[PDB]
Amino acid sequence: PQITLWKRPLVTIKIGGQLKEALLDTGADDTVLEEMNLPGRWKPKMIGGIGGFIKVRQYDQILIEICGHKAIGTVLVGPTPVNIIGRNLLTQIGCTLNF
Amino acid sequence: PQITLWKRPLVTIKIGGQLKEALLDTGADDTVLEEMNLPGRWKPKMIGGIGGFIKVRQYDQILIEICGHKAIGTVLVGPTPVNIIGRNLLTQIGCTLNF
Ligand SMILES: CC[C@H](C)CN(C[C@@H](O)[C@H](Cc1ccccc1)NC(=O)O[C@H]1CO[C@H]2OCC[C@H]21)S(=O)(=O)c1ccc(N)cc1
Numbered sequence: 001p002q003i004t005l006w007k008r009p010l011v012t013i014k015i016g017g018q019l020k021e022a023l024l025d026t027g028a029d030d031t032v033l034e035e036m037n038l039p040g041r042w043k044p045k046m047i048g049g050i051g052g053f054i055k056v057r058q059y060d061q062i063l064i065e066i067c068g069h070k071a072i073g074t075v076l077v078g079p080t081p082v083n084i085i086g087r088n089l090l091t092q093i094g095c096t097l098n099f
Numbered sequence: 100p101q102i103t104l105w106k107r108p109l110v111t112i113k114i115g116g117q118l119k120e121a122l123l124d125t126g127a128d129d130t131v132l133e134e135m136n137l138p139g140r141w142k143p144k145m146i147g148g149i150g151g152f153i154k155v156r157q158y159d160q161i162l163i164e165i166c167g168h169k170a171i172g173t174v175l176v177g178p179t180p181v182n183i184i185g186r187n188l189l190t191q192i193g194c195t196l197n198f
Pocket residue numbers: 023025026027028029030031032047048049050051081082084086124126127128129130131146147148149180181183185
Protein backbone atom coordinates (compact mmCIF):
# COMPACT_ATOMS: atom_id res chain seq x y z
CA PRO A 1 0.00 0.00 0.00
CA GLN A 2 0.82 3.71 -0.10
CA ILE A 3 0.92 5.25 3.38
CA THR A 4 0.62 8.99 3.96
CA LEU A 5 2.13 10.55 7.06
CA TRP A 6 -0.56 12.82 8.50
CA LYS A 7 -0.93 10.13 11.18
CA ARG A 8 1.67 7.83 12.70
CA PRO A 9 2.34 4.96 10.21
CA LEU A 10 1.14 2.22 12.55
CA VAL A 11 0.56 -1.31 11.23
CA THR A 12 -0.30 -4.72 12.62
CA ILE A 13 2.59 -7.17 12.88
CA LYS A 14 2.74 -10.85 13.80
CA ILE A 15 5.68 -12.21 15.78
CA GLY A 16 5.98 -15.33 17.91
CA GLY A 17 2.39 -16.08 16.93
CA GLN A 18 1.11 -12.87 18.55
CA LEU A 19 -0.37 -9.77 16.92
CA LYS A 20 0.91 -6.31 17.84
CA GLU A 21 0.90 -2.74 16.60
CA ALA A 22 4.20 -1.26 15.43
CA LEU A 23 5.49 1.98 13.93
CA LEU A 24 7.17 1.96 10.51
CA ASP A 25 10.24 4.01 11.40
CA THR A 26 12.60 4.97 8.59
CA GLY A 27 14.81 6.73 11.16
CA ALA A 28 15.56 3.47 12.97
CA ASP A 29 18.42 1.29 11.73
CA ASP A 30 17.05 -1.59 13.81
CA THR A 31 13.72 -3.01 14.92
CA VAL A 32 12.98 -2.61 18.63
CA LEU A 33 9.90 -4.09 20.32
CA GLU A 34 8.48 -3.68 23.80
CA GLU A 35 9.08 -6.31 26.46
CA MET A 36 7.82 -9.74 25.39
CA ASN A 37 8.65 -13.44 25.52
CA LEU A 38 10.29 -14.92 22.42
CA PRO A 39 11.55 -18.50 22.11
CA GLY A 40 15.13 -19.35 21.28
CA ARG A 41 18.55 -18.05 22.21
CA TRP A 42 19.23 -14.34 22.69
CA LYS A 43 22.21 -12.16 23.53
CA PRO A 44 22.43 -8.88 25.47
CA LYS A 45 23.09 -5.71 23.49
CA MET A 46 22.92 -1.93 23.83
CA ILE A 47 21.17 0.54 21.50
CA GLY A 48 21.11 4.34 21.54
CA GLY A 49 18.22 6.61 20.66
CA ILE A 50 17.52 10.33 21.01
CA GLY A 51 17.60 10.19 24.81
CA GLY A 52 20.45 7.78 25.45
CA PHE A 53 21.16 4.06 25.47
CA ILE A 54 19.06 1.13 26.69
CA LYS A 55 19.77 -2.53 27.36
CA VAL A 56 17.99 -4.87 24.95
CA ARG A 57 17.79 -8.56 24.07
CA GLN A 58 18.86 -9.37 20.52
CA TYR A 59 16.96 -12.12 18.69
CA ASP A 60 18.31 -13.20 15.31
CA GLN A 61 16.51 -14.74 12.33
CA ILE A 62 13.06 -14.10 13.83
CA LEU A 63 10.02 -14.56 11.61
CA ILE A 64 7.85 -11.44 11.62
CA GLU A 65 5.03 -10.46 9.27
CA ILE A 66 4.45 -6.72 8.76
CA CYS A 67 1.11 -5.70 7.24
CA GLY A 68 0.90 -8.98 5.34
CA HIS A 69 4.57 -9.05 4.23
CA LYS A 70 6.95 -11.62 5.70
CA ALA A 71 10.45 -10.87 6.96
CA ILE A 72 13.12 -12.81 8.84
CA GLY A 73 15.73 -10.81 10.69
CA THR A 74 17.02 -9.28 13.88
CA VAL A 75 14.58 -8.11 16.55
CA LEU A 76 15.67 -6.21 19.65
CA VAL A 77 13.45 -6.43 22.73
CA GLY A 78 13.62 -3.87 25.51
CA PRO A 79 12.16 -0.73 27.11
CA THR A 80 11.40 1.20 23.92
CA PRO A 81 8.54 3.73 24.17
CA VAL A 82 6.77 2.00 21.25
CA ASN A 83 7.24 -0.94 18.90
CA ILE A 84 9.30 0.35 15.96
CA ILE A 85 10.02 -1.40 12.67
CA GLY A 86 13.43 -0.28 11.42
CA ARG A 87 15.26 -0.42 8.13
CA ASN A 88 16.64 -3.92 8.66
CA LEU A 89 13.09 -5.20 8.12
CA LEU A 90 11.62 -2.38 6.03
CA THR A 91 14.11 -3.34 3.31
CA GLN A 92 12.90 -6.96 3.41
CA ILE A 93 9.28 -5.96 2.71
CA GLY A 94 10.26 -3.67 -0.18
CA CYS A 95 9.53 -0.40 1.60
CA THR A 96 10.68 2.87 0.04
CA LEU A 97 10.12 6.57 0.63
CA ASN A 98 8.55 8.48 -2.25
CA PHE A 99 7.99 12.19 -2.83
CA PRO B 100 12.21 10.73 -6.20
CA GLN B 101 12.25 7.25 -4.64
CA ILE B 102 14.55 6.49 -1.71
CA THR B 103 15.40 2.93 -0.77
CA LEU B 104 16.22 2.08 2.83
CA TRP B 105 19.45 0.10 2.47
CA LYS B 106 21.13 3.09 4.12
CA ARG B 107 19.94 5.94 6.31
CA PRO B 108 17.61 8.22 4.26
CA LEU B 109 19.78 11.34 4.56
CA VAL B 110 19.04 14.33 2.32
CA THR B 111 20.16 17.94 2.10
CA ILE B 112 17.94 20.58 3.69
CA LYS B 113 18.09 24.37 3.75
CA ILE B 114 17.11 26.15 6.98
CA GLY B 115 17.95 29.61 8.28
CA GLY B 116 20.11 30.06 5.20
CA GLN B 117 22.18 26.97 6.11
CA LEU B 118 22.55 23.67 4.28
CA LYS B 119 22.45 20.55 6.46
CA GLU B 120 22.04 16.79 6.13
CA ALA B 121 18.86 15.44 7.73
CA LEU B 122 17.11 12.11 8.17
CA LEU B 123 13.70 11.61 6.55
CA ASP B 124 12.07 9.94 9.55
CA THR B 125 8.52 8.57 9.42
CA GLY B 126 8.90 7.60 13.09
CA ALA B 127 9.40 11.20 14.23
CA ASP B 128 6.22 13.16 14.94
CA ASP B 129 8.03 16.49 14.64
CA THR B 130 11.22 17.80 13.06
CA VAL B 131 14.18 18.15 15.44
CA LEU B 132 17.48 19.70 14.35
CA GLU B 133 20.89 19.72 15.99
CA GLU B 134 21.75 22.77 18.09
CA MET B 135 21.69 25.95 16.01
CA ASN B 136 21.19 29.64 16.75
CA LEU B 137 17.85 30.47 15.12
CA PRO B 138 16.38 33.94 15.76
CA GLY B 139 12.89 34.53 17.07
CA ARG B 140 10.77 33.42 19.99
CA TRP B 141 10.47 29.81 21.09
CA LYS B 142 8.81 27.59 23.68
CA PRO B 143 10.45 24.85 25.78
CA LYS B 144 9.50 21.26 25.02
CA MET B 145 10.58 17.73 25.89
CA ILE B 146 10.48 14.87 23.39
CA GLY B 147 10.92 11.21 24.25
CA GLY B 148 12.34 8.20 22.48
CA ILE B 149 14.74 5.36 23.10
CA GLY B 150 16.86 6.27 26.12
CA GLY B 151 14.44 8.86 27.50
CA PHE B 152 13.81 12.54 26.83
CA ILE B 153 15.77 15.57 25.67
CA LYS B 154 14.93 19.25 26.15
CA VAL B 155 14.44 21.22 22.92
CA ARG B 156 13.37 24.67 21.77
CA GLN B 157 10.20 24.75 19.66
CA TYR B 158 10.15 27.30 16.83
CA ASP B 159 6.99 27.76 14.76
CA GLN B 160 6.49 28.62 11.08
CA ILE B 161 10.11 27.95 10.14
CA LEU B 162 10.76 27.59 6.41
CA ILE B 163 12.73 24.49 5.42
CA GLU B 164 13.60 23.32 1.90
CA ILE B 165 13.93 19.53 1.60
CA CYS B 166 15.38 18.37 -1.73
CA GLY B 167 14.10 21.47 -3.48
CA HIS B 168 10.66 21.00 -1.88
CA LYS B 169 9.64 23.92 0.33
CA ALA B 170 7.86 23.42 3.64
CA ILE B 171 7.02 25.56 6.65
CA GLY B 172 6.12 24.44 10.15
CA THR B 173 7.39 23.55 13.58
CA VAL B 174 11.12 22.96 14.00
CA LEU B 175 12.51 21.74 17.32
CA VAL B 176 16.13 22.55 18.18
CA GLY B 177 18.17 20.71 20.80
CA PRO B 178 20.92 18.18 21.55
CA THR B 179 19.83 15.58 19.01
CA PRO B 180 22.62 13.36 17.62
CA VAL B 181 21.10 13.66 14.13
CA ASN B 182 19.02 16.15 12.17
CA ILE B 183 15.55 14.62 11.81
CA ILE B 184 12.78 15.60 9.39
CA GLY B 185 9.53 14.48 10.99
CA ARG B 186 6.02 13.86 9.73
CA ASN B 187 4.93 17.46 10.34
CA LEU B 188 7.10 18.44 7.36
CA LEU B 189 7.20 15.16 5.42
CA THR B 190 3.47 15.54 4.70
CA GLN B 191 4.11 19.01 3.28
CA ILE B 192 6.51 17.60 0.66
CA GLY B 193 4.17 14.77 -0.34
CA CYS B 194 6.33 12.01 1.12
CA THR B 195 4.77 8.55 1.38
CA LEU B 196 5.78 5.06 2.45
CA ASN B 197 5.25 2.44 -0.23
CA PHE B 198 5.50 -1.35 -0.24
C1 LIG C 1 9.05 6.88 19.74
C2 LIG C 1 9.25 6.63 18.24
C3 LIG C 1 10.70 6.88 17.82
C4 LIG C 1 11.67 6.11 18.73
C5 LIG C 1 10.97 8.37 17.91
N1 LIG C 1 12.28 8.72 17.37
C6 LIG C 1 12.47 8.71 15.93
C7 LIG C 1 13.29 7.49 15.52
O1 LIG C 1 13.30 7.38 14.13
C8 LIG C 1 14.73 7.60 16.03
C9 LIG C 1 15.50 8.70 15.31
C10 LIG C 1 16.96 8.65 15.76
C11 LIG C 1 18.03 8.11 14.82
C12 LIG C 1 19.49 8.04 15.28
C13 LIG C 1 19.87 8.52 16.67
C14 LIG C 1 18.80 9.06 17.61
C15 LIG C 1 17.35 9.13 17.15
N2 LIG C 1 15.39 6.36 15.70
C16 LIG C 1 15.79 5.40 16.70
O2 LIG C 1 15.67 5.63 17.87
O3 LIG C 1 16.30 4.21 16.20
C17 LIG C 1 17.02 3.28 17.13
C18 LIG C 1 16.73 2.10 16.79
O4 LIG C 1 17.65 1.84 15.46
C19 LIG C 1 18.77 2.44 15.67
O5 LIG C 1 19.12 3.42 14.49
C20 LIG C 1 18.88 4.64 14.94
C21 LIG C 1 18.99 4.56 16.56
C22 LIG C 1 18.55 3.34 16.90
S1 LIG C 1 13.06 9.97 18.22
O6 LIG C 1 14.39 10.24 17.67
O7 LIG C 1 13.32 9.60 19.61
C23 LIG C 1 11.99 11.41 18.07
C24 LIG C 1 10.84 11.62 19.03
C25 LIG C 1 9.95 12.83 18.87
C26 LIG C 1 10.21 13.82 17.74
N3 LIG C 1 9.37 14.98 17.58
C27 LIG C 1 11.36 13.60 16.78
C28 LIG C 1 12.26 12.39 16.93
